[PDB]
Amino acid sequence: LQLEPPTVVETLRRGSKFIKWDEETSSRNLVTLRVDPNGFFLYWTGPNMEVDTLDISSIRDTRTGRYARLPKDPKIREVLGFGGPDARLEEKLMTVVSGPDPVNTVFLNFMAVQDDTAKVWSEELFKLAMNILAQNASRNTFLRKAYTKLKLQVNQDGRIPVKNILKMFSADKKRVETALESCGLKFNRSESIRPDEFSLEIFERFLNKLCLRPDIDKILLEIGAKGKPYLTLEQLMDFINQKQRDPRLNEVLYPPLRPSQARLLIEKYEPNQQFLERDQMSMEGFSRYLGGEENGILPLEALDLSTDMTQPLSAYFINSSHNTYLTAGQLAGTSSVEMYRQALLWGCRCVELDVWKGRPPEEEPFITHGFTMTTEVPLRDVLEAIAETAFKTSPYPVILSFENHVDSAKQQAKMAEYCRSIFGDALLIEPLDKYPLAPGVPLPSPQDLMGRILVKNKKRPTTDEGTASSEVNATEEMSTLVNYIEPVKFKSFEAARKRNKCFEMSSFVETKAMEQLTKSPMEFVEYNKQQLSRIYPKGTRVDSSNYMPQLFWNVGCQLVALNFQTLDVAMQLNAGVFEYNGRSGYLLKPEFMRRPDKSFDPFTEVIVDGIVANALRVKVISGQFLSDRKVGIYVEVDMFGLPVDTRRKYRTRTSQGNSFNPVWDEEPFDFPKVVLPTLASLRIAAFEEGGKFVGHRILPVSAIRSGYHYVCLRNEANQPLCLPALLIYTEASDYIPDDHQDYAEALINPIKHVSLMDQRARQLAALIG
Amino acid sequence: ARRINDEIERQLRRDKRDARRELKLLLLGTGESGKSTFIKQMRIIHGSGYSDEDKRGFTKLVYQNIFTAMQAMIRAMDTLKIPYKYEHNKAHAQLVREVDVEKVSAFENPYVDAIKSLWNDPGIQECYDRRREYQLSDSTKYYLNDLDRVADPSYLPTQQDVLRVRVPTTGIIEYPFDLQSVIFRMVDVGGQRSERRKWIHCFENVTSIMFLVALSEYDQVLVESDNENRMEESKALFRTIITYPWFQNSSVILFLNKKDLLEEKIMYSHLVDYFPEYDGPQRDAQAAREFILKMFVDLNPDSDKIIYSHFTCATDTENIRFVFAAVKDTILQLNLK
Numbered sequence A: 001l002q003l004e005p006p007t008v009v010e011t012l013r014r015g016s017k018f019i020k021w022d023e024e025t026s027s028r029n030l031v032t033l034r035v036d037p038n039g040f041f042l043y044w045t046g047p048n049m050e051v052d053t054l055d056i057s058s059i060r061d062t063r064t065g066r067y068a069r070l071p072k073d074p075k076i077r078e079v080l081g082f083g084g085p086d087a088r089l090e091e092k093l094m095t096v097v098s099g100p101d102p103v104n105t106v107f108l109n110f111m112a113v114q115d116d117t118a119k120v121w122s123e124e125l126f127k128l129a130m131n132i133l134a135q136n137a138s139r140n141t142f143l144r145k146a147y148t149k150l151k152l153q154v155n156q157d158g159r160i161p162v163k164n165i166l167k168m169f170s171a172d173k174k175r176v177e178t179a180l181e182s183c184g185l186k187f188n189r190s191e192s193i194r195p196d197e198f199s200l201e202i203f204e205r206f207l208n209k210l211c212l213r214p215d216i217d218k219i220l221l222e223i224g225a226k227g228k229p230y231l232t233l234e235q236l237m238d239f240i241n242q243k244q245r246d247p248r249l250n251e252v253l254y255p256p257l258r259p260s261q262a263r264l265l266i267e268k269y270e271p272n273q274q275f276l277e278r279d280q281m282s283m284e285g286f287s288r289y290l291g292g293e294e295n296g297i298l299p300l301e302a303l304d305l306s307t308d309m310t311q312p313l314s315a316y317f318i319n320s321s322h323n324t325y326l327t328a329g330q331l332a333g334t335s336s337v338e339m340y341r342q343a344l345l346w347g348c349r350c351v352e353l354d355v356w357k358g359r360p361p362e363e364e365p366f367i368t369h370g371f372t373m374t375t376e377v378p379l380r381d382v383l384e385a386i387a388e389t390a391f392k393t394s395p396y397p398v399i400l401s402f403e404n405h406v407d408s409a410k411q412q413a414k415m416a417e418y419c420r421s422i423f424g425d426a427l428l429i430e431p432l433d434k435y436p437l438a439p440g441v442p443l444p445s446p447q448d449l450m451g452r453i454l455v456k457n458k459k460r461p462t463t464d465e466g467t468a469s470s471e472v473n474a475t476e477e478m479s480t481l482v483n484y485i486e487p488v489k490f491k492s493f494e495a496a497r498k499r500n501k502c503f504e505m506s507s508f509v510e511t512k513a514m515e516q517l518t519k520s521p522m523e524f525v526e527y528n529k530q531q532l533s534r535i536y537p538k539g540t541r542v543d544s545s546n547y548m549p550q551l552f553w554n555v556g557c558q559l560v561a562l563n564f565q566t567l568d569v570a571m572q573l574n575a576g577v578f579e580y581n582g583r584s585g586y587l588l589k590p591e592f593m594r595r596p597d598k599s600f601d602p603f604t605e606v607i608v609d610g611i612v613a614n615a616l617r618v619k620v621i622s623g624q625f626l627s628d629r630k631v632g633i634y635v636e637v638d639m640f641g642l643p644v645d646t647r648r649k650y651r652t653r654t655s656q657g658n659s660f661n662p663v664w665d666e667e668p669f670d671f672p673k674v675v676l677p678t679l680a681s682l683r684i685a686a687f688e689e690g691g692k693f694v695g696h697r698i699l700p701v702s703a704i705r706s707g708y709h710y711v712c713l714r715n716e717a718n719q720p721l722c723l724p725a726l727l728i729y730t731e732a733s734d735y736i737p738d739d740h741q742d743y744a745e746a747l748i749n750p751i752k753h754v755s756l757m758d759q760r761a762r763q764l765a766a767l768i769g
Numbered sequence B: 001a002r003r004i005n006d007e008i009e010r011q012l013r014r015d016k017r018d019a020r021r022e023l024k025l026l027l028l029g030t031g032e033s034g035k036s037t038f039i040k041q042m043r044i045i046h047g048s049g050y051s052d053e054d055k056r057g058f059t060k061l062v063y064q065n066i067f068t069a070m071q072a073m074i075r076a077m078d079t080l081k082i083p084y085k086y087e088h089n090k091a092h093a094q095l096v097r098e099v100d101v102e103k104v105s106a107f108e109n110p111y112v113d114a115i116k117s118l119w120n121d122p123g124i125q126e127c128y129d130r131r132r133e134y135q136l137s138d139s140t141k142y143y144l145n146d147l148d149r150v151a152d153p154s155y156l157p158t159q160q161d162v163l164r165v166r167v168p169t170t171g172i173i174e175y176p177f178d179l180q181s182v183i184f185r186m187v188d189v190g191g192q193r194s195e196r197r198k199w200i201h202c203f204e205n206v207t208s209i210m211f212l213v214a215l216s217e218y219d220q221v222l223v224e225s226d227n228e229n230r231m232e233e234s235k236a237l238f239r240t241i242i243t244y245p246w247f248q249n250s251s252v253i254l255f256l257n258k259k260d261l262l263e264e265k266i267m268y269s270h271l272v273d274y275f276p277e278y279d280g281p282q283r284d285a286q287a288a289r290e291f292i293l294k295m296f297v298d299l300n301p302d303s304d305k306i307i308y309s310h311f312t313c314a315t316d317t318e319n320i321r322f323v324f325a326a327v328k329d330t331i332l333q334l335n336l337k
């Protein structure tokens, strides 16, 4: 049991009874909550008799019980029965948080009818929203989602209205009317089709007639299909073993496609028994295989938590946040307890806490940005929220980065209690017996600290370094919890490295860290091998803007912190790279960046010894369903890795005009020399004319397959977008230098090289001897 | 005057450590020539030996070797149309086929009894003799003999058992070893055709080339291409690497490995069959070895490159100490002077 298809159990199918309630509109409506069989949508009958559907892939978290949201209007409380008899009313509360990004999130609150119906729902609906296969699924599946939506959103008379479709694919109107009439489904009378004569197959033939695909036909003509109609079983098998394979992988570990296997593909994909009976696959069945479950762009092994988790903590990149309490601009904006929950739900493992003194009347430490017109959320509420959602997305260690300004043993002792009171066993009060806190003793692995929390405080005003400069002196209470992550002031690499303590670590502001990158880079890597290093953004960035974290990953920095508030290019990448290794937020560094004996220069302009460098070619072919409106689209293709690898210049032309089914015939975007592929990452992104964002995707250079594939696009917070998707061709291969082509050839088949050259020296002999 | 003179010796200890140089050795070869099994032995002798924690790391793979070795066995019963003798093995045979190879951690009643049963079938044993026709790992015979020890609930494989496991190497990994007076950086690489394209990335600053051939390859065919002889690839893949400009002032060491299996396979399969121009006796342990040795040493374009060659057995720990002691000297005396 690694990754399982998101099965929706019995209760969720037919659905139990609930009470939806709203505060600002004072609503209290009954609703029969239902999730469809394939696990696409959560729908119910609305108050208007409208079918209001909710996208499951946009669920961020589902809260149950005491952790669920409670009403804050007096009259709403009483009408639910909170001023009533039973202490049972919490056991039926369920709050479903939804949204595209963590800043903008609407809350849907519910109340159950039966005892414990609410409990089982929360946790089962949660596993749907955060399933891996569900999110990374095929192109086939993503269309069915589109079909499921149209079938669900029915009008008063229980029918699928005409305009529903015209506004979904609003990239055309005139065509769509001819396409539905071609299907024979009468929309002419009352502009609404019945759900009976709108089966999955009818929706299929609809798009085949509406969406004309010339690109797929050129690709048919290539693979020996000059006799156009069909493809033989051999043509298909050979096509997969020459194009669709990844030539980097071994032949014995990953074997080619056998003929008996290729048969099962035809059976699953070809609808005509006219062609399935003959061991052939039509154009219609090929269009499906391209978007099928086997022919994805990425392999499953990439998305799965299948990276080693036993290496030292320092040998991993870690997903990290800066000033996580803030939800807007760094200055006058507001703070929120909720952002800490959302942060840890992302996959983040390091979160910052700028705690402060209390007030004279009471005595509660609170969190906020050092006097700067920010709202002041309390400490207890934050710690409790962390204690909830810390180990929901990922069961791997979390780092509470305490930026202490509490200047009294009175209230500083109080936060020592709050930690032990709230977290309890999860808090790592003392060291492990295997790894003590000695010089030379390496950091424990992520697996050695599964489900544990580590405090980051001292033990025993600056223009651009912020409130992190003048941090207060830690006291004897708080210092007890600190152990494996000890922040100390940095002197120099030799000093802190020859000291030979591993648990010790120093934080770096963006600008000071930047100079160390330029002035002494190899020295940085060899510090990061042993010890830890945090990197937070400078104080100049007053609008919560982000620096490029790839900069510092190149030299082996673990905690490259960012502003989760904004989702710019930088955060778009941080989001999409930690998706891998099963959303764990722990990505294992490339061999040489964490090996003591090896040492390489991050700036090398030539291949490194030992490191198997790769060569990548990306040709953009076409796209489908890229807009709710006729408008031009253009595609960008960028690579982020070492500076030597990093290019972000390539861009397609603006499309003819069609945002429905545009096709680009363009020169492939070449990345001929990728020195360190294990670190580097490809990035396809689609835009409208005048820079309007549509959908991007981050792909690792290491795992990306070669051949014709669809690339299911995502929003800025790497959530799966339904309709939009590109068709691209790829060629990831092992790098052979230009000078050593023929040399590399001999090795691959020396039976021919020996022979064909020996033969020469033999038949040349009678001329000399 | 003890603690002061203590840290004078500790200084002079770390003196020799950092002051000695390291030499980069490449372990090259065709598929399954026994290259990784060699490194394991170097780890046994001059590296970190195998702890009981480490020995149970492979206990999962030892099970998967039995299934992969048995799954491929049962397919050959259909390939070659070999009939089963006992018919109650047909129920067990269907059961083993349909087991996934990848997800196998346990080893229990449902299958242990079944696999035992299949190994005693005459049709299956007749199949083992004809294993030169399909692809089947050499360690198969070792493991299926002692299925009883493996079936045990508290089974922990010995060091011998961990040499025999079949885990195919991919890419380029660099295992260093300290031999007191000098460090040996030993690069292990993949053997199959896909993996040879990669090799290029580790040829710079090479001191020596420990090439590895398997003697018992002479009748078998490549897994990567079922239309060619394995020994003929080794022969040609050697020829290639000797020509290369890279390795001009590099020593060449030819390990003729799997010598034990040559004495077994010679007493029924003949060398005269697959390499015609062999004038020596048939069923020959000795001269059949010697004809192979000279076959490689005569493919030498450099008339001055003296190719230092040893026959070896990669699963024997005590054969490698002898062979590597001499190879250690041959190397050191060619670089230091």
Ligand SMILES: Nc1nc2c(ncn2[C@@H]2O[C@H](COP(=O)(O)OP(=O)(O)O)[C@@H](O)[C@H]2O)c(=O)[nH]1
Binding pocket: B029, B030, B031, B032, B033, B034, B035, B036, B037, B038, B137, B138, B139, B163, B164, B165, B166, B167, B168, B169, B191, B257, B258, B259, B260, B261, B312, B313, B314, B315, B316
């Ligand atoms: N009988 C015998 N088997 C060996 C010897 N050396 C290696 N093997 C086996 O042959 C297989 C191939 O070894 P391996 O190092 O994986 O081959 P590589 O992939 O070419 O490095 C392994 O399963 C070993 O157990 C040997 O000297 N004698």
Ligand code: ALF
Binding pocket: B030, B031, B032, B033, B035, B036, B167, B168, B169, B170, B189, B190, B191, B192
């Ligand atoms: F044939 Al190998 F590692 F060289 F499996």
Ligand SMILES: [Ca+2]
Binding pocket: A323, A352, A354, A403, A466, A467, A468
């Ligand atoms: Ca701060």
Ligand SMILES: [Mg+2]
Binding pocket: B035, B036, B037, B167, B168, B169, B189, B190, B191
């Ligand atoms: Mg190997």
